[PDB]
Design a protein around this ligand. Structure first.
Ligand SMILES: Nc1nc2c(ncn2[C@@H]2O[C@H](COP(=O)(O)OP(=O)(O)O)[C@@H](O)[C@H]2O)c(=O)[nH]1
Ligand SMILES: [Mg+2]
Length: 224
């Protein structure tokens, strides 16, 4: 009966902080670019009015470019902790600052989780306070960022804004807006979570590794 959220996106966009805003506590550690990067998954637990909310905060290593060996066993761990599948993938971007590294992070989500995990993805904009009480929809309508338009469209126009430093009632207000989207998206899905061939495999570490390499390979075969 729980709700499963997986935080994804470029490093330093504010997803760990986003997890904290949603759960309304000190769950994951926010951190500057100066700090040491995470190689391991972290999970946390909360609730939003009779529904238990479960968040999985993926490591920064997921976004890394070249060969990292510790990647495969941590993708298995991320899959095992989100089993049997996430209801929502939460792609976190900084408002007004969507770059190549962001497009690249959005690619890795597709590569790892599946090309249609985007149909269970909501785009979360951080630094909401830069709108100055302005509409997030109106800012998106008048955006010249062509690559962000692609990502939002692939996510079915589902967008949201967060000020991760907001406290008290202002925090509830913005989290409700997200909880509205989740609710609306889940209605489109009839309460279903996202699953793939890899979640089915999880009902050892070697067989998953081999199955994950093959899966990721296929997801790149579409992108041609
Ligand atoms: N002003 C502002 N800063 C934010 C917001 N969200 C995150 N940050 C800051 O961005 C930095 C990186 O945050 P972090 O959660 O570690 O980003 P992550 O790498 O995506 O997990 C921290 O110093 C946060 O305080 C926001 O909505 N507004
Ligand atoms: Mg982080």
């Amino acid at each position: 009966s729980e709700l499963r959220i997986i935080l994804v996106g470029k490093t330093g966009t504010g997803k760990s902080a986003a997890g904290n805003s949603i759960l309304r506590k000190q769950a994951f550690e926010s951190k500057l670019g100066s700090q040491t990067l995470t190689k391991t998954c972290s999970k946390s637990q909360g609730s939003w009015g009779n529904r238990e909310i479960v968040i999985i905060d993926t490591p920064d290593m997921f976004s890394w470019k070249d060969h990292c060996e510790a990647l495969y066993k941590e993708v298995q761990r991320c899959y095992l902790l989100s089993a049997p599948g996430p209801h929502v993938l939460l792609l976190v971007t900084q408002l007004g600052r969507y770059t190549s590294q962001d497009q690249q992070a959005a690619q890795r989500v597709k590569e790892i989780f599946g090309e249609d995990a985007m149909g269970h993805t909501i785009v979360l904009f951080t630094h909401k306070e830069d709108l100055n009480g302005g509409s997030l929809m109106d800012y998106m309508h008048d955006s010249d960022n062509k690559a962000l338009s692609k990502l939002v469209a692939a996510c079915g126009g589902r967008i949201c804004a967060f000020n991760n430093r907001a406290e008290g009632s202002n925090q509830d207000d913005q989290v409700k807006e997200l909880m509205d989207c989740i609710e609306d998206l889940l209605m489109e899905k009839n309460g279903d979570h996202y699953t793939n061939g890899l979640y089915s495999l999880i009902q050892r570490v070697k067989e998953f590794k081999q199955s994950l390499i093959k899966y990721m390979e296929t997801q790149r075969s579409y992108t041609a």
